[PDB]
């Protein structure tokens, strides 16, 4: 029972970074050597586990989170980092275990006119707790007078758009990111790779 | 505080070819105010997240202000090329800082036509990053030397942005301010509140 990472990796449409997706892997043998056929420069940064020796192991479970972010922002997906994404869009715990895989997708998520279907949150009252999603679109009160649903003076919309284009620089081209999180519990391991 | 008012509320911005250069140091800068310029405006930032600029600290901040056409605003970015990018203003690839562009059709438009905004059109080669060319010699496109007569193959290097409020969004004037930060061995002084 090879785990279906292909659907998780070869999907046509990844969700926005703020409303990221979540997928569960269970009761299947996982072959990690398959995904090496991806883009020739896919970052495979692994915390708490060596990437090469992942084949012989018995992860009690595996959660896969997939989204699309900016190039310069790819360094923000790491335990303990800070910034716009680490605070308001996606937070990783301090004692994180698992791997992050990032690869450029300028040939699939770029529109000469401009792709506006990828959004990201810019304003929030407080930093996100680890592994938390906030899809609310409430008006942000940056001042003292209550906004009451108008985007006037010191009242900003919390979401902005990644207006992707194929002519952008390397630091602004879209990058597809998939984060695999493992775990160990009292339950017996369900996903054991060859 | 820092003089971000005389740089964002000035009556007239300089031309794109002879763009302005403003030094900023020993000042406390509150960048959040820059979010009230317009309901919808361009705020790209390279190498630093905008939401984490009121907690970091730099040695000096350089502000460059000018006015460019609406559809050409995409040329002000590292690695880009076109007409403005290589003939008027070239951004280095190893760039950290922000570009802030917003429409100003209500302040830089004349029904008769604004002829005070100029841009260079002809140059022998391209421009190095952060370089200014303010020369005005006639340009010999062909082989015959004309020695300063605008006939055939001899065009004036500069053209004018004849702005009018009737024009579309792609031709309306846009005010652009580029803030550049850098770190040196010297202690930081330009910090947010």
């Amino acid at each position, epitope marked *: 029972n090879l785990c279906p990472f292909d659907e998780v990796f070869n999907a*046509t449409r990844f*969700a926005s970074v703020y409303a990221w997706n979540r997928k569960r892997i269970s009761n299947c043998v996982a072959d990690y050597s398959v995904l090496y056929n991806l883009a020739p420069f896919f970052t495979f940064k692994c915390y708490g586990v060596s990437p090469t020796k992942l084949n012989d192991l018995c992860f009690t479970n595996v959660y896969a989170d997939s989204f699309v972010i900016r190039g310069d922002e790819v360094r923000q997906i790491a335990p303990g980092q800070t910034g716009n994404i680490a605070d308001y869009n996606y937070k990783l715990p301090d004692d994180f275990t698992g791997c992050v895989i990032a690869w450029n997708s300028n040939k699939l998520d770029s*529109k*000469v*006119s401009g792709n*506006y*279907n990828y*959004l990201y949150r810019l304003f929030r009252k407080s930093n996100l707790k680890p592994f938390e999603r906030d899809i609310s679109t409430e008006i942000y009160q940056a001042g003292n007078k209550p906004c009451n649903g108008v985007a006037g003076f010191n009242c900003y919309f919390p979401l902005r758009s990644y207006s992707f284009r194929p002519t952008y620089g390397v630091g602004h081209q879209p990058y597809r990111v998939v984060v695999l999180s493992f775990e160990l519990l009292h339950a017996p391991a369900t996903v054991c790779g060859p | 505080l820092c003089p971000f008012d005389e740089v964002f509320n000035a009556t007239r911005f300089a031309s794109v070819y002879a763009w302005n250069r403003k030094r900023i140091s020993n000042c406390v800068a509150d960048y959040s105010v820059l979010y009230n310029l317009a*309901p*919808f405006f361009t705020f790209k930032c390279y190498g630093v997240s905008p939401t984490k600029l009121n907690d970091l600290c730099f040695t000096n901040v350089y502000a460059d202000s000018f006015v460019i056409r609406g559809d050409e605003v995409r040329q002000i970015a590292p690695g880009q090329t076109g007409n403005i990018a290589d003939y008027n203003y070239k951004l280095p690839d190893d760039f950290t800082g922000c570009v802030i562009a917003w429409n100003s059709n209500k302040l830089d438009s004349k029904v008769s036509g604004n002829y005070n905004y100029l841009y260079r059109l002809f140059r022998k080669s391209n421009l190095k990053p952060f370089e200014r060319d303010i020369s005005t010699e006639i340009y010999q496109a062909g082989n015959k030397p004309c020695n300063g007569v605008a006939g055939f193959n001899c065009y004036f290097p500069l053209r004018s942005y004849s702005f009018r409020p009737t024009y579309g969004v792609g031709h309306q004037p846009y005010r652009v301010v580029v803030l550049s930060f850098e770190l040196l061995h010297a202690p930081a002084t330009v910090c947010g509140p």
Partner: antibody
Amino acid sequence: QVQLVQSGAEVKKPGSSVKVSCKASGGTFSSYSFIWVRQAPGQGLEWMGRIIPILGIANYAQKFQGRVTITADKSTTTAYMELSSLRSEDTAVYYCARGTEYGDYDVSHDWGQGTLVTVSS
Amino acid sequence: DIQMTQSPSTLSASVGDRVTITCRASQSISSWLAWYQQKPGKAPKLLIYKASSLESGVPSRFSGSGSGTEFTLTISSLQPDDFATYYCQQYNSYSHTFGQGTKLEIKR
């Protein structure tokens, strides 16, 4: 689920302007994009323009630039199209279409019934 | 402006057959493409977007494929309800042009 209702047929003189309304019901209004399409009486569809209200960005065809204006109303949850300086060949059937954020804003998922606009003497 | 052409302009088929329609773009449009079905006198209906993805509710007998400047759509088992006019649309770069429109009729 989500359905759109358009106004009635219109008959206008060449030297006039026309406003067409498009009221959408169902779901959340802010996660929508509105596009307008025109079909000649015998030929195929023609693209006119797209509006993203929540991002507040408008885009129109080069042929119709300076003539067509698309706006949105959150209070009534409607979309309005203003066409100015009509001509003899501007008579056609007009369709209102909506694009979702998750799928694609540019593509059209749901379509209105369309309004017939006639220009003559 | 990318000009989109379709082929054939008019096709004659019969119920139970498998039919194919080709759509060509003057310039590259990546994988951004959409197909619409319009009945006589009715509003169009979306069938396929992204040139491969099917809109929810569309019968599974439709299927499209293409990479760039060459796209195709096919119906594996033609049904009596499937006789209509089919239109292309590319949404890469502004002025999202449609196609000429391929019409589907019945053989006699």
